[model samples]
Target: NLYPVKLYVYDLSKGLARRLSPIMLGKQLEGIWHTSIVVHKDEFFFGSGGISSCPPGGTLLGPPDSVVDVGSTEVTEEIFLEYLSSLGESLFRGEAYNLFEHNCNTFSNEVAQFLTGRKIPSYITDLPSEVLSTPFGQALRPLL
Candidate 1:
């Protein structure tokens, strides 16, 4: 396949940021969404609860907020899934699901790097810090 890999960004809030984020801590994201990496049409989605594999457009909300071309990969689905399983297992065992440090955005960022040798956009990574800058965000930091 010419483009065997793609990255999907979802905004769960569906544009309810003003109503949600400021009231809640920074956790109140404009897009409290998750991300998944699609390799060979199989999508790998990881979240605080766990990681899972799904078909394209499966298990996602309506449409993706954005879809990025993470680049092509010759790796077979079996091999890629195996790698994902190992990575997922490590995080599951280590309990590495922090709101600020190890959230879905971070997972997508890492996955993008692993697949394409590049990082996702800075806005994605910078969100936690930006949220934390607000007074409400600071107050709710411990909870997040």
Candidate 2:
């Protein structure tokens, strides 16, 4: 009734987040957390293209820096597919994207919990709050 699932973690910054974050965000953020859920060998994630289902690491963000075993799930691929379909039309539409509030990391947390009853790691989930707490991050808020 359960299968292993993984989180493919990509840095939208391509390793530059650590290099530049101190200057831009006033703190050393690990990366701009862009995450995808992998179950039944397919990657599910949300982004500017709305929702995507593909081979792990197949998206334009390139290969993930690492893969994490968040946990396992009883939700089969078919069930997850249906879940993805509903999200695309409702909350995760391409036009619905927002940098801080409703972006890809938000989507990852939603799916990980639905599939595994566990939350995405705090380092990733906490990034948005961490950024906005900074003066520069606040100044950039209007654009985010």
Candidate 3:
């Protein structure tokens, strides 16, 4: 069961795209790292936790398989695309209006397939973009 409590997580993006994306203009930018979300007790945006919880090798970002790779060692294609989204560039080019979206969704659903042991629905395909872009609007929302 998912809890209603909020937790801070990192979103990886291209340095240039991050600057261009007006949605990411300002608030508190701690710099972009592969492990961007620095969950600290005092630094955490939401939830009642301590720095120890956010420290490396301690916090769990996604399911073990989901968070550990991405341009480091070997990241899932879904993650590579999410990082692409921050760049503000089309994921796919050449007569492909939303090709990037399509590809990312496709790759993401594939991962879901392995995880769920079933074919992921189309609806599931669209979720990664939203999850990654969650920061766009809520860049400066309340911490708790």
Candidate 4:
């Protein structure tokens, strides 16, 4: 049986990304997006603490500001939990995280694809590259 799922998207920067982008990069940008996959009753995401599962809205950032229907999966809760476990030992390990590269959005994209054969919105997954391509971000590389 297939279970319905969703992708929860959060903006860690509040509205700062929009307001500051013109000064920072010579153009406006969408929010600095953080994403998670929701299956069954909880939300799953990856960060410097490894993969974490929390009640929806219980994360430090509080309730998601948006949710997207990401299709369904036949995978059960047990197997999905196990899948996250398998990830812990490899790509999703805490130390493997990189803010501009392999970040939470990357993890969400991977999980979203694993569960439903779909990728998260490219604008979210592609932000890092876009940032570095700009003059301000290029000058800020030493800090990155």
Best by the lDDT measure: 4
Give the per-residue lDDT of model 3 (tens digit) for 1-144: 211111222433434434655445433333232222211111111111211223433445431222322111133435433543432234323233232244433433333333333343443344334435456535533431
lDDT of 2 by residue, 17-51 (tens): 89999898778887888888888988888878899
lDDT of 2 at 63: 81
**Deviating ranges (above 4 Å) for candidate 2:** none
Cα misplacement distance, residue 144 of candidate 3 (Å): 40
Give the range of the ten consecutive residues with the poorest summed lDDT in model 4. Answer: 135-144
Ranking by TM-score: 4, 2, 1, 3
Backbone clash count, each prediction separately: 0, 0, 3, 0
lDDT (Cα atoms) of all candidates against the true structure: 0.72, 0.86, 0.32, 0.90
**Model 3: clashing residue pairs?**
10-37, 41-51, 70-75
In model 1, the clashing pairs are none
Q: What is the number of residue pairs that collide in model 1? A: 0
**TM-scores for all candidates?**
0.79, 0.89, 0.22, 0.95
Runs off by more than 4 Å, candidate 4 = none
Q: How close is candidate 1 to the true structure, as a TM-score?
A: 0.79
lDDT of model number 4: 0.90
Comparing 3 and 4 on lDDT, the stronger one: 4
User: For candidate 4, lDDT tens digit of each residue in 1-144?
Assistant: 989989999988998999998898887787988998889899898989899989987889898979899999999999998899999998999999888989999999999899999998999999988889999888987896
Give the lDDT of residue 16 in candidate 2. 91
